[PDB]
């Protein structure tokens, strides 16, 4: 019996602000690939909705007093009803909040310059020159602090003890990547969109996990199943297939 | 403990010959999306295999004995081992053969020029000016044949009088609405390919159904299943989609 | 937290008396279509259940005054928590009850013998020798007291006129087909399955419609989503379809 | 066509006896992750099963004659269809029967007692006053009887040396850590079961390996693969993470 708080950020291609020589309002500031998204899931579901940029700019992970932040966090305290962002589905974050099935498969890999000898995490892991890191409290940087596996760790001790490794995003990393010897542990669609873009970096390896983004609601929410099912129709009807090729679609 | 014979036919860009100075023979003789896949299958499960191109060039139906023909019936006669190939999984062939699961999603849906008053199937339904039809003894056809929707036993009987309507191929059926008043059922992953390819065609309307192709093998076979967990590895491991983007990647 | 009570109805190929040399009891008593797919959803949902049949041994319709019977009165007054059945779906239903997205799809169509001209609704009503009509107070008798298309209200004149061509289920109707000159108007897959069985009985003409069958639910059902989600994962896996041969297979 | 018989054994929380008031028999005397795991199984291939706990009570390994005993004994006899327990996936019984892709991983860790300074293999090595072992003819045993690395070669000699430190399953292991001064070399989702519910033990430094567990089969079992699908599917549906969430919840 109302319209619903969308909670996002700014990541490119999947949320934007739109470019327009008059000034835009309210929704109508944003464009890209979740955008999209929440209009057709807004058209098959019938809601209406107001999109909010979170304040502190991120997804969300746990302190040790073990509190969130971040999209994660505003769905928590039940300040948006949705989460609908490229948010990563993962079984930490299913203990606080609950996930739509993904609308887009992803995993974690390597982003840095082409040309070089290195070729795996192992090789990052091994040595010191080449610095690396991840977001900051994102699912990519708790995947590192949160792993058994002996290179994880390992790599988990050299970023966490960087000072400067953890950046605030994506942009930040990119810039860091392209301005110094560093390389981005990024999650592998996002990988493929600047890689088209920017025909000097590349991605190293192969994926290091497999997961997926979904919708992001409170606990206990009746909008989760719904939104899985409108979803699954999309994927049916084919729609978001078309919706990727058309925010992600040349390098020599 | 042997190769296996591996069935399929050209069609772009699933299954095509190579472009080569010097004369190519067996298995070099062909590039494609499915060479690739099938590549990446026998690199997995470790076999060894030759690829044979079905005799009458066709996917498979049945006429009215109950007998098959295309790589379904080479199936069947156990002539091969896998049909590697565009090859729809259908509840009807499943009756016959058995499928891996998909590795690839589509639905039918037409194709036809752009510019005119045509939205729909029903649209062409309702009138006889323009002419359509469907590939014969492909599964479009076996769809029109056999369904029970009012609209579409409206379209089988027109499609089915016409003696011209139903073509030998895809590369006729395009060349059919390029020439003629012809909108050609086709499937929604090869109109894809030929709208990025002829600015003049588009995709008339959304799918009509939705279904996937799989890897068809003999009813019975060992085989199916360990596809099927090699189609899942693939998939886990993002090489599907990068498979697609390769084959399948503008028109103002 | 509790077991859900699904209510229910005998219905071949779908709800049947499993055949046994002892009584049998409770939830054991039955087998058939809808009684694996409810065990389906009983398993990927997580719930228990208890099975009961409709008292009245009906669909479900309204009267005059707008009241309901059949499983549909059983959702509507919480009686059951899931109606478990060829339950078709339609719009005046839809206001009463939930339903999950289809399992199975159909069209109404005609059941007669083998061998005579009729060929179509059309052949039918032209004529009036051979007498029809349709199960009391089920989707197909509603279809054709409400259309506005001129062959049907032609017909339900007919059923609304005699007393005896509504019959009282689908055996009934079947029985009557075997037994006097009449046709009945039924939905498609079971005439599709009684045609494998009785080869002096055949399908005349098309389907005159296209619907589907869904598990129903009161409205506000916390598990109307999730069956629907159950349905959707059995489809994809093609369960549903090798659960139509294990039932169907002249 | 008949029943699989499946080989088990007890070990919490993985498979144990229900509690009763009354002396139950059959599989309904079980319960636990890998029974819930067993029912997924059953219920997605179709096949009914008699559980059978393996006579000797050992997970399997080889002797110098190069013979199995345990769970794989039974597989590689054909006295069992399927070994559905915590059964480490390794390279020696890889080449003697089949598992499935791993529906739950895991590393060799150490178990003991809170407030000491001791915090790795490392430093129990170095060290012969706080004693040690594992299970016998289990992986973890055999892991530590094929390494060539240093440290653990060092071990394998003072487990290979006392009578005492090879122990006959978990549970009397754990009674160990309680009990004496000793160290457990266990794997590490049992170890965090165990430091749940005991706050007088804790788990010593990190993982010495990374493994999974799978379902066991015979060589050429006709149902390896589809049981690798099913355990993908349960995996996909997050059905793994909830049926550990609910064993394994200081
Ligand atoms: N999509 C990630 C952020 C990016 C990353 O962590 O790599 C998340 O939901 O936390
Ligand atoms: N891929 C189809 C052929 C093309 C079509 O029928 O549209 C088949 O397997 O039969
Ligand atoms: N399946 C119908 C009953 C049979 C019929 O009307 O033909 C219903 O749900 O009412
Ligand atoms: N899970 C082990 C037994 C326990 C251990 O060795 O620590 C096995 O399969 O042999
Ligand atoms: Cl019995
Ligand atoms: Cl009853
Ligand atoms: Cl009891
Ligand atoms: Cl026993
Ligand atoms: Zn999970
Ligand atoms: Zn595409
Ligand atoms: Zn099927
Ligand atoms: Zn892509
Ligand atoms: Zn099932
Ligand atoms: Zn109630
Ligand atoms: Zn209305
Ligand atoms: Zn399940
Ligand atoms: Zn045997
Ligand atoms: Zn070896």
């Given at each position: 019996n109302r319209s619903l708080i969308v909670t996002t950020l700014l990541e490119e291609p999947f949320v934007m602000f739109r470019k327009s020589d008059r000034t835009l309002y309210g929704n109508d500031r944003f464009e890209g690939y979740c955008i999209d998204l929440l209009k057709e899931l807004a058209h098959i579901l019938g809601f209406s909705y107001e999109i909010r940029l979170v304040e502190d700019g991120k997804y969300g992970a746990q302190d040790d007093k073990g509190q969130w932040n971040g999209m994660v966090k505003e769905l928590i305290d039940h300040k948006a009803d949705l989460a609908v962002a490229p948010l990563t589905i993962t079984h930490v974050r299913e203990k606080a909040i609950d996930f739509s099935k993904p609308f887009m498969t992803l995993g974690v890999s390597i982003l840095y310059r082409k040309g070089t000898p290195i070729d795996s995490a192992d090789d990052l892991a091994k040595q010191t020159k080449i610095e690396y890191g991840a977001v900051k409290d994102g699912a990519t940087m708790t995947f590192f602090k949160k792993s058994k596996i002996s290179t994880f760790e390992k790599m988990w001790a050299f970023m966490s003890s960087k000072?400067?490794?953890?950046?605030?995003?994506n942009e930040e990393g990119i810039q860091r990547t392209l301005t110094a010897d560093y390389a981005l542990l990024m999650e592998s669609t996002t990988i493929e969109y600047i890689t088209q873009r920017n025909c000097n970096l590349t991605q190293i390896g192969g994926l290091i996990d497999s997961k997926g983004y979904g919708i992001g609601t409170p606990?206990?929410?009746?909008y989760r199943d719904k939104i899985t099912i409108a979803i699954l129709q999309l994927q049916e009807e084919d729609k978001l297939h078309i919706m990727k090729e058309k925010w992600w679609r040349g390098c020599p």
């Open positions: 000072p400067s490794a953890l950046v605030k995003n606990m206990g929410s009746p």
